[PDB]
Each structure stands twice: as structure tokens, then as C-alpha cells.
Amino acid sequence: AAQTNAPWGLARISSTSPGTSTYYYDESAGQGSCVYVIDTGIEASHPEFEGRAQMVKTYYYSSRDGNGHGTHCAGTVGSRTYGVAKKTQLFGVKVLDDNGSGQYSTIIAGMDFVASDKNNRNCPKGVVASLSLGGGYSSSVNSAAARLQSSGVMVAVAAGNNNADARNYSPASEPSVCTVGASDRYDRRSSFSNYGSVLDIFGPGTSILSTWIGGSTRSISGTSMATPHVAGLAAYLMTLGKTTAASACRYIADTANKGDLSNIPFGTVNLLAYNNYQA
């Protein structure tokens, strides 16, 4: 399949070259996979989700995404127009309040929630968690992400927007999950993107168009936006039978576009998420 005039990030992950506008993808589109978007929630009513989104857990009275961030990153995973895996199931876990804030304990609880929740879901192609959040280093946050991964969830996490080594940030520094840096449409490392040896992969992160609350769309930037690209790609690749939850991070790195990014600090992978789809 081909989505013309797609967000640059979708076209990027299907192209060996920047500057294209067409997103090429196998029509399976991540069907049979599920992605938990662990964030401010998901406006599941957004037409862009076509009923494939739902809230499964909140840590506030409301499952309603009163921020936009979770709806935005859900959109990049598998929203209709703006998503990588356009047929995947999206589950909303609202660990961040509507200001985007969340206690570590709440984030840890949300990850533990997914690890068991996925046993009440039908995700025959596998299960992904997209964590577009982060704070300073936390061994207990890291171990929460490690458990989720261990449980058989493909965890993707944002490297953080500090223009610093991601070793000082959690869950970004958890080695066993997929730590995602951000690139811009010119294949530069995003200005804010964290870096370091813990990074597993880069994805489009600057000026990413996707869903927003109120049935709308907006473009925002962050490794938080690159994360759902990789989670979507993993859901897509799992549905294709190309990898598993345990191996998706390394499979995406193995098959990534290598050496195409600029301003990658020495010691940080130079790997851009790529679906390698041959139409």
C-alpha cells in the first residue's frame, strides 16, 4: 500500500532517502497487533482511530486525554492518516495527568498494568508499549520497563528531550527496552534529542503531524513523538511475522537505515527506523 502526501515521518520510515512524501507499507498494517500507549490518554472517539483505540486504564478520575500528547502519540502508532500501523489496536493507559505530569510510582504502576492487561486482550501478532514520557534516572522506573519487556511486550521509550546522554534518564536508560532518539526531516538528529550508547534507534521526532484532542491534528516535536513511530513499526513488523516482541528492537536496528543521520555524537547509534517494505 501507499499513502500519498503522508506526514514526513511516515514517508521517512519507508524510504532509504529523506524528502519523500509517500508512506509505503504492507497492507497488513499491524492488524492482529496491539499497542499500549502509556501517556496522557487517548481520545478514542477521534475519527482517525476508526474505533481501534480505547482507554483501558487511568490513574486520575478521567480516562479522557485533556492534554493531547497521548492522543497524538496514539495517532502516530496507528491513527488512520498519521499512523505507522494503521490497523493495529490501541490501548490507552493514562499515567500522565492532563498537564503531562506523572509520579514515578504511577508510571511504574501503568507499566505493571500493561504486563498483565495484555493477557485480557487478543493480540495474536504480539503486544507493543509506546512510552512517550520520561524523567530523571530511576532504577525502579527502569526495572518497571524491564519487567514489561520481559513479560513479552515490545517496549519503546523516548530517549528524552534534554540534548544530553540518555543514561541519566528513565526509562530511557533501561538497556532491555528500545530507547528512541529523534530525527528531523533533513535526517539531522533533532536539536533536543538525547543521545548516548543506550539509544537503540532513531525515529522521526521533529514537527510530527498526528491526531490531537478535540478531533483535531497538530504537529509537535520530541523523542516522545519518535517513540510511537518505532512502536508502530514494531507492531507492523510483528504482524508481518518478521520479528517478536523480544527481538523487535534489535530487528529494527538491524534493518534500519544506517549512517544517514547527521550530528550523531560519537558512540551513539546512527540508525533510523525503516520498514524496508518492497512494494
Catalytic residue annotation: 39, 69, 224
**Is residue 175 part of an annotated ligand binding site?**
yes
Rounded distance between C-alpha atoms, residue 256 and residue 101, angstroms: 32
Rounded distance between C-alpha atoms, residue 253 and residue 122, angstroms: 27
Rounded distance between C-alpha atoms, residue 47 and residue 216, angstroms: 9
Cell matching residue 41 = 490518554
Q: Pairing relation of β-strands 208-212 and 153-158?
A: unpaired
Say which residue the cell 528492537 belongs to. 249
Confirm if 42 and 53 have CB atoms less than 8 A apart: yes
Confirm if 41 and 78 have CB atoms less than 8 A apart: no
Rounded distance between C-alpha atoms, residue 217 and residue 235, angstroms: 23
Question: For residue 128, which amino acid is it?
Answer: V
* Spatial CA neighbour of 161 closest among 102, 202, 222, 204: 222
**Is residue 200 part of an annotated ligand binding site?**
yes
Burial of residue 224 (number of CB atoms within 10 Å: 0-12, 13-18, 19+): buried
Rounded distance between C-alpha atoms, residue 30 and residue 88, angstroms: 5
What's phi and psi for 54, nearest 5 deg?
-155, 150
- Calculate helix-pair angle for 139-150, 104-117, nearest 10 degrees: 10
Say which residue the cell 501503568 belongs to. 110
Binding residues: 16, 175, 177, 200, 260
Residue positions in the annotated binding site for Ca(2+)?
16, 175, 177, 200, 260
